[PDB]
Design an enzyme around this catalytic site. Sequence first.
Site, PDB file in Angstrom:
ATOM      1  N   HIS A 130      -7.552  -6.191   0.465  1.00 14.54           N
ATOM      2  CA  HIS A 130      -6.378  -5.340   0.671  1.00 14.54           C
ATOM      3  C   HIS A 130      -5.689  -5.688   1.989  1.00 14.54           C
ATOM      4  O   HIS A 130      -6.337  -5.716   3.038  1.00 14.54           O
ATOM      5  CB  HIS A 130      -6.861  -3.892   0.745  1.00 14.54           C
ATOM      6  CG  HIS A 130      -5.761  -2.882   0.864  1.00 14.54           C
ATOM      7  ND1 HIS A 130      -4.908  -2.590  -0.174  1.00 14.54           N
ATOM      8  CD2 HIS A 130      -5.393  -2.084   1.892  1.00 14.54           C
ATOM      9  CE1 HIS A 130      -4.064  -1.644   0.204  1.00 14.54           C
ATOM     10  NE2 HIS A 130      -4.334  -1.325   1.458  1.00 14.54           N
ATOM     11  N   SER A 145       0.837  -1.202   0.000  1.00 19.95           N
ATOM     12  CA  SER A 145       0.000   0.000   0.000  1.00 19.95           C
ATOM     13  C   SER A 145       0.879   1.263   0.000  1.00 19.95           C
ATOM     14  O   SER A 145       1.696   1.444  -0.934  1.00 19.95           O
ATOM     15  CB  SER A 145      -1.008  -0.055   1.161  1.00 19.95           C
ATOM     16  OG  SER A 145      -2.078   0.850   0.929  1.00 19.95           O
ATOM     17  N   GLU A 162      -9.148  -5.556  -3.711  1.00 17.29           N
ATOM     18  CA  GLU A 162      -8.571  -4.359  -3.083  1.00 17.29           C
ATOM     19  C   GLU A 162      -9.596  -3.387  -2.437  1.00 17.29           C
ATOM     20  O   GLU A 162      -9.349  -2.851  -1.345  1.00 17.29           O
ATOM     21  CB  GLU A 162      -7.715  -3.566  -4.077  1.00 17.29           C
ATOM     22  CG  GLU A 162      -6.471  -4.324  -4.614  1.00 17.29           C
ATOM     23  CD  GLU A 162      -5.341  -4.386  -3.597  1.00 17.29           C
ATOM     24  OE1 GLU A 162      -5.496  -3.792  -2.509  1.00 17.29           O
ATOM     25  OE2 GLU A 162      -4.304  -5.033  -3.872  1.00 17.29           O
TER      26      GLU A 162
END
EC number: 3.1.1.8
Lengths: 527, 527
Positions: free
Chosen positions: B436, B196, B323
């Site tokens: 995610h 990320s 995600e």
Amino acid sequence: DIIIATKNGKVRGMQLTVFGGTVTAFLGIPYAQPPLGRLRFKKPQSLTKWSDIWNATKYANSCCQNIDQSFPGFHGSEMWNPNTDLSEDCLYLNVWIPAPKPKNATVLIWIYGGGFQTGTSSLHVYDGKFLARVERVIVVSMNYRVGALGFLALPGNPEAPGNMGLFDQQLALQWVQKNIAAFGGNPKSVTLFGESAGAASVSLHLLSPGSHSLFTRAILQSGSFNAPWAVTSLYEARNRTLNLAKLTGCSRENETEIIKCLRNKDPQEILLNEAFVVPYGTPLSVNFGPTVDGDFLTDMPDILLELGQFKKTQILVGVNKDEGTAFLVYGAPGFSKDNNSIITRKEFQEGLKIFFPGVSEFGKESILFHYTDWVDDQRPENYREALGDVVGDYNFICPALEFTKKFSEWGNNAFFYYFEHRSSKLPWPEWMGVMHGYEIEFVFGLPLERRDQYTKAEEILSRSIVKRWANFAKYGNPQETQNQSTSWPVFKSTEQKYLTLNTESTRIMTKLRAQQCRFWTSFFPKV
Amino acid sequence: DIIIATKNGKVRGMQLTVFGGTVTAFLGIPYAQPPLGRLRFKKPQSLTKWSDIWNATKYANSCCQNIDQSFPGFHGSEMWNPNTDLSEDCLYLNVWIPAPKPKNATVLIWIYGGGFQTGTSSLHVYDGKFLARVERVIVVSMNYRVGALGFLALPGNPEAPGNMGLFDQQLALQWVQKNIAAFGGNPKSVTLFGESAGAASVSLHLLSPGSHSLFTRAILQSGSFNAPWAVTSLYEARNRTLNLAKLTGCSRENETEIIKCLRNKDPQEILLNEAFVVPYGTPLSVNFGPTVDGDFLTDMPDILLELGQFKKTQILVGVNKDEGTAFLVYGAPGFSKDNNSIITRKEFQEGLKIFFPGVSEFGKESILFHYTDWVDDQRPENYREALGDVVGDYNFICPALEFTKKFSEWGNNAFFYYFEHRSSKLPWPEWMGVMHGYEIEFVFGLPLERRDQYTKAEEILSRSIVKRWANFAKYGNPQETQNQSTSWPVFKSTEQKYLTLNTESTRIMTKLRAQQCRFWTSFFPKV
Ligand SMILES: *[C@@H]1O[C@H](CO[C@@H]2O[C@@H](C)[C@@H](O)[C@@H](O)[C@@H]2O)[C@@H](O[C@@H]2O[C@H](CO)[C@@H](O)[C@H](O)[C@H]2NC(C)=O)[C@H](O)[C@H]1NC(C)=O
Ligand SMILES: *[C@@H]1O[C@H](CO[C@@H]2O[C@@H](C)[C@@H](O)[C@@H](O)[C@@H]2O)[C@@H](O[C@@H]2O[C@H](CO)[C@@H](O)[C@H](O)[C@H]2NC(C)=O)[C@H](O)[C@H]1NC(C)=O
Ligand SMILES: *[C@@H]1O[C@H](CO[C@H]2O[C@@H](C)[C@@H](O)[C@@H](O)[C@@H]2O)[C@@H](O[C@@H]2O[C@H](CO)[C@@H](O)[C@H](O)[C@H]2NC(C)=O)[C@H](O)[C@H]1NC(C)=O
Ligand SMILES: *[C@@H]1O[C@H](CO[C@H]2O[C@@H](C)[C@@H](O)[C@@H](O)[C@@H]2O)[C@@H](O[C@@H]2O[C@H](CO)[C@@H](O)[C@H](O)[C@H]2NC(C)=O)[C@H](O)[C@H]1NC(C)=O
Ligand SMILES: *[C@@H]1O[C@H](CO[C@@H]2O[C@@H](C)[C@@H](O)[C@@H](O)[C@@H]2O)[C@@H](O)[C@H](O)[C@H]1NC(C)=O
Ligand SMILES: *[C@@H]1O[C@H](CO[C@@H]2O[C@@H](C)[C@@H](O)[C@@H](O)[C@@H]2O)[C@@H](O)[C@H](O)[C@H]1NC(C)=O
Ligand SMILES: *[C@@H]1O[C@H](CO)[C@@H](O)[C@H](O)[C@H]1NC(C)=O
Ligand SMILES: *[C@@H]1O[C@H](CO)[C@@H](O)[C@H](O)[C@H]1NC(C)=O
Ligand SMILES: *[C@@H]1O[C@H](CO)[C@@H](O)[C@H](O)[C@H]1NC(C)=O
Ligand SMILES: *[C@@H]1O[C@H](CO)[C@@H](O)[C@H](O)[C@H]1NC(C)=O
Ligand SMILES: *[C@H]1O[C@H](CO)[C@@H](O)[C@H](O)[C@H]1NC(C)=O
Ligand SMILES: *[C@H]1O[C@H](CO)[C@@H](O)[C@H](O)[C@H]1NC(C)=O
Ligand SMILES: [Cl-]
Ligand SMILES: [Cl-]
Ligand SMILES: [F-]
Ligand SMILES: [F-]
Ligand code: NA
């Protein structure tokens, strides 16, 4: 005295003086049974044959059609209106041949435009005598049925099967195959050419198996079948046929009975009601057009094009710099041929409503977003120019480019032009620029007539265009080989080279309207 | 007893038992002067050096940050919250080395995510002891400043120049260059990896000339600088710095005086006001992020990427199947981790307002049009799935793909993965899918611990991932060469092959999210 023996009888032509020479014109030769009475709405029937001499010494009747009455007395609009009597008895063609009679001349066959609703081969801008004189080609043109009388469709029903006007054209092509040798023509060297709906028609003959052996090569000026105005869906056609029925008192339970009723109506009653068969129309409405009839067109023409199902031959395709402007004075608010037509943002938005009557709000917004990112100036003519480009790009330019790309992908040589010369004589205002329809006079060689007040640069441009078109027809290659001219490169899907046509300098350019056409072609079919 | 002599002093580590073996951990080694008092908001300053032995036997303080309090008591959210005391005195790093001490081991340096606002290297999912044990690599991770304390920018002013958290990272990379040989590490074989915001950070080190000689290769999990959340504009930064000033009573005429005032505020007052520096925020807000400071970043990073101005080396990049889902329960109406979150069309539309707070109506409509052409079913979960994909594609997947394309165009080997395995232990509901953040535990080898109740298929998947990451770090090539595995092909701009990662069958696929990314990448930057 010039008499030619055709398959169906003798025809007498007439001698014309052209450029200190002679051309023999045979105007108004019949090529089919008049489509009257019970033959109304049917495919054209073959001709019975005649003794004695048919005098082909004047242009024949034009097909029944509504007329552009928007600007009475104005040459810019009136020049497109029919110049012979209107009649359902209109299936005639014209032949111009050089003198002395040629031995085996290449043949150019003109198919006029007019939205499939109007048109005639007798217009002064389609006069084939200059081409015959200058290039020693034979020129042929035909009248074909337009509007409901040419295109009314109740699909699968031989009483009104659709595409009759296209079968008129096809039967004229057949006449040429069968008869042109008698006139000194080579049936093995026939090039179709047409503009707007005529160009769309030429593209459909490329797709039609029945037309395959009737011509050699094709020229498409400002039009192709994949233009959004060029093909009526079966759903639209049925609705429009039924609407016409309702409007004329011809609604019936039995569909063959509907058609019977329609055959009893005066043609004037049919014409009168054509505009109303749709709830809303645009200046580009094609109320009665080509359809998938399972005869002339075997499948949706987009599928045929995508999958390579078409005549394998060379094509010459092109468009004019300002295709869209002509239509803007037929209903877009703030526009006038009699002022500079500076419109506001709101007027632009209203214009989109006129041209995209629905079309979601999102669809119209997307058009606005793509075309009004002013970079930058402001620049009062911003919105005016944007609306012209929207209309020209969506209706003519992007479809012609997509047609050329998809066609060339199957291995054939294609040549693309961008015509950017505005006639010194144009009666429309300057803001309209290089208009739809105004390359035609250059193709037909009218500026070669010195008596006519075109400029010298225009004479030269026309002469060059005429040579390139003739070389394309004769040899498949639109070059002008003698005067150190720019070579016209083949258009290929990668690279996409095209030739600009103008009085100053002929240029090789690439990827015409790349950004704009990505919008129309890739995105807008979804919206 | 394990004591290593570093450039700045001796450190004592500790022995850990891992998989019937031993790993030596040095937790909480200082790598910079604590950024306190007058050093707040400044680039990190070098360490003074110490006699005696630093006991690196526990994780150090985490940097000051706001905490996710959305779901108290819930492991899915709380697992990301800091697990050591918060302090401005937080510039420490961790080193795990195999035992016996390696001779010249490849080094993996982890950079955590958390939107540049949160995060710490001491989380259980970043525990580097399994990698050290299993692959005999050295693992390093650092704490770097986050939020305003790490990223406040008044551009060009050395009192608050921006990018301090990135310079923290860079100074830890320098520490590794200078010190890792002492620990048996090879400074010439250093791979950065991060997820990320950590992955965005890794991508910026690729662009930073100061970071060029500090690492060899790079791994980017679910992030890259070209993600829309990853770089703050100079305009935004100035506004946000001034807003923070206003909110804390620190508004001044003189900008150096603003910063002086801010250095007097309790760090808690700064944290408290961070959320409010923007008029509207999203669940993906990065209030204080990387900026173009003319130091760490010399130009707009998009320009640098486009024009090939970056370290020439191999990259491994990838994303997770779902995600976007994690963010939907942080403010999208109708969403809940505690139900199946079937939302309506209206709720979907409201969701877009949450994630695209402006963003024109047209922009939001275009998103709706692209993502809600149901083909077809209906299918109550239509809108729910669409919003997750919108958020994941715009924020993570399409930017990672564009980064990989543009990077590989300059000649380097790139490898792309699509992680599609959902942890058997995931505490979030099934509708959220492959979330995610949830590949990280697989990369770090947690499922290799049999005591942990992962499935056997997960142990195998983790082992495979761990080998491929290690082979990428050591050899530039993420293969698993021994167990008849699928070969991971290079990702090239033409073709765009990627490798799927899951428990059943590893597949080579092409052109991930091709249609969706054409929308975000080509069109949406305009809107
Ligand atoms: C198909 O035709 C119908 C009916 O058309 C109407 O009647 C015809 C005889 C003719 O006079 C047309 O101009 C009339 O519109 C269309 O239905 C109309 O649709 C509009 C929507 O814009 C609606 O406001 C009208 O009330 C409708 N009229 C009637 C009588 O129902 C219909 O739109 C056509 N289908 C298409 C274009 O796909
Ligand atoms: C730049 O900041 C201004 C001011 O932000 C306001 O005051 C700050 C101290 C902080 O408390 C913020 O949350 C406040 O919003 C922004 O101006 C605001 O813009 C919104 C538009 O959505 C408007 O409704 C408010 O009235 C404005 N507030 C004031 C005090 O003028 C501005 O939007 C920011 N610029 C950006 C984001 O580009
Ligand atoms: C250009 O003319 C248009 C078209 O309409 C006008 O044509 C003029 C040449 C003149 O004869 C005038 O009387 C005639 O109406 C103008 O658009 C018109 O503007 C008026 C505002 O009074 C509107 O009420 C009309 O609906 C509108 N007509 C159309 C068809 O939209 C236009 O304003 C003018 N543009 C200029 C001078 O820049
Ligand atoms: C799934 O739950 C959401 C979220 O809000 C609810 O969480 C539930 C688990 C329950 O505790 C409930 O009391 C709590 O409010 C539901 O959305 C909510 O729906 C109500 C309608 O009464 C709205 O007024 C709320 O604003 C709205 N909350 C949010 C955050 O949008 C949702 O309806 C539910 N979905 C189902 C059962 O499919
Ligand atoms: C007329 O010429 C014919 C050949 O035409 C040429 O070849 C065909 C395939 C096309 O490419 C066309 O453009 C060419 O002009 C002969 O078959 C025919 O016999 C000739 N007729 C004559 C001389 O009377
Ligand atoms: C450690 O090994 C060094 C070489 O490292 C290798 O080559 C570099 C360029 C990278 O590709 C890296 O991945 C490789 O591992 C030697 O220079 C160095 O002297 C070695 N140190 C020792 C043996 O103490
Ligand atoms: C055709 O025209 C010629 C004039 O040369 C004439 O001899 C002949 O009778 C005409 N035929 C008609 C009018 O049918
Ligand atoms: C080429 O040049 C000649 C002589 O200069 C000229 O008369 C003619 O118009 C030109 N031909 C064409 C086809 O343009
Ligand atoms: C570090 O830990 C060791 C315990 O083995 C101890 O001898 C030493 O005094 C410690 N140093 C400290 C706490 O500063
Ligand atoms: C490969 O196979 C061996 C023996 O079957 C197994 O123990 C190991 O987990 C596998 N290695 C990797 C790197 O997946
Ligand atoms: C409707 O019935 C009439 C009766 O004469 C006839 O023309 C036909 O069989 C029917 N119509 C169609 C389209 O089949
Ligand atoms: C503002 O004036 C003060 C006076 O001490 C000083 O810090 C500085 O020169 C000025 N600020 C800036 C940003 O130049
Ligand atoms: Cl508006
Ligand atoms: Cl709606
Ligand atoms: F030329
Ligand atoms: F694998
Ligand atoms: Na769009």
